[PDB]
Design a protein around this nucleic acid. Structure first.
Ligand SMILES: *Sc1nc2[nH]cnc2c(=O)[nH]1
Ligand SMILES: O=c1[nH]c(S)nc2[nH]cnc12
Ligand SMILES: O=c1[nH]c(S)nc2[nH]cnc12
Length: 266
DNA sequence: CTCTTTTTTCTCG
DNA sequence: GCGAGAAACAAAGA
């Protein structure tokens, strides 16, 4: 999932599990709890969920006043709310049991992570990872964005994927964003002119906010509609609606990359 | 059978 | 510092 998918999950969880006391926590794959499963079980059992927040692609469970559970779904992580007698499925790894249901985390590839962080260490946690601003008009300052692009010789797609210029883009939405902003994914950022950076900035915000509104692209959050609106991602050889031009797929910095050459020249 | 394909961090030169 | 490639892992497809 990327930011819109994580936000969709956040919103559904917020509706269902806020106010709920954690009765027990169980793991079949404790190794995904990077801060230590025993510690997390001991600290969180019997606590009440106060809220669910998000920073970039990270889910943040607010559990009691003094702890947060930071969850990353990485490539394939999925949450679901199930009855207490629900059978185990093959790639289920963790469950948070309540009095009247349970929250189960599953992840085929086992990439997703849980970290128990004290409340006053949440802002330092994200500072240490150098996560950039949220993709909103209020938080995403174009002026700083422009200065960082000017000072780098990185290619724009991998630099956007680093999460440092702005938080939340992954492979799908960065491809969508660059098509919308008419920018080549291998464009060196210090070659971008001011008007292109402005369109890029606005496009990042517009695409991600649209995806959030449509419930992401497609367990919780599996009812998304953004997939119907994708212009280039996963559409190799299909039309760009531009006079017969077709989407090409190339590899950029190790990632599958979908773009429309005629639209996205350097 | 092999090889490639699908977020973040780590290693190497 | 940089980029390239690979690591963590599972499953599906060519
Ligand atoms: S360049 C181009 N050609 C078209 N032919 C039908 N519609 C077109 C369009 O929107 N753009
Ligand atoms: O944190 C990252 N997330 C993604 S999607 N791509 C990257 N390339 C380098 N870092 C990152
Ligand atoms: O009208 C457009 N034409 C092309 S070629 N690319 C685009 N990206 C966003 N709009 C367009």
């Amino acid at each position: 999932p990327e930011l819109p998918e994580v936000e969709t999950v956040r919103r559904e969880l917020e509706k269902r599990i806020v106010g709920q006391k954690i009765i027990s926590i169980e793991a079949t794959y404790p190794r995904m709890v990077l801060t230590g499963f025993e510690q997390l079980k001991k600290e969180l059992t019997g606590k009440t969920i106060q809220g669910i927040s998000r920073r970039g692609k990270y889910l943040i469970f607010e559990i009691g006043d003094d702890f947060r559970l930071i969850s990353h779904l990485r490539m394939e992580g999925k949450y679901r709310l199930a009855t207490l007698d629900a059978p185990r499925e093959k790639h289920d790894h963790l469950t948070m049991k309540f009095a009247d249901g349970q929250l189960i985390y599953a992840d085929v590839r086992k990439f997703g992570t849980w970290e128990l962080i004290s409340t006053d260490q949440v802002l330092p946690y994200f500072l240490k990872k150098k996560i950039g601003p949220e993709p909103t008009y209020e938080d995403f300052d174009e002026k700083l964005f422009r200065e960082k692009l000017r000072k780098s010789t990185k290619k724009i797609k991998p630099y956007l994927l680093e999460q440092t210029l702005v938080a939340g883009l992954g492979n799908i939405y960065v491809d969508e964003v660059l098509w919308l902003a008419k920018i080549h994914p291998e464009k060196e950022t210090n070659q971008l002119i001011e008007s292109s950076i402005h369109l890029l900035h606005d496009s990042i915000i517009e695409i991600l906010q649209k995806a959030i509104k449509l419930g992401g692209s497609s367990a919780l959050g599996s009812t998304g509609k953004m997939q119907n609106e994708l212009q280039v991602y996963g559409k190799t050889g299909e039309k760009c609606s531009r006079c017969g031009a077709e989407i090409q797929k190339i590899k950029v910095a190790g990632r599958g990359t979908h773009f429309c050459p005629v639209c996205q020249q350097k």
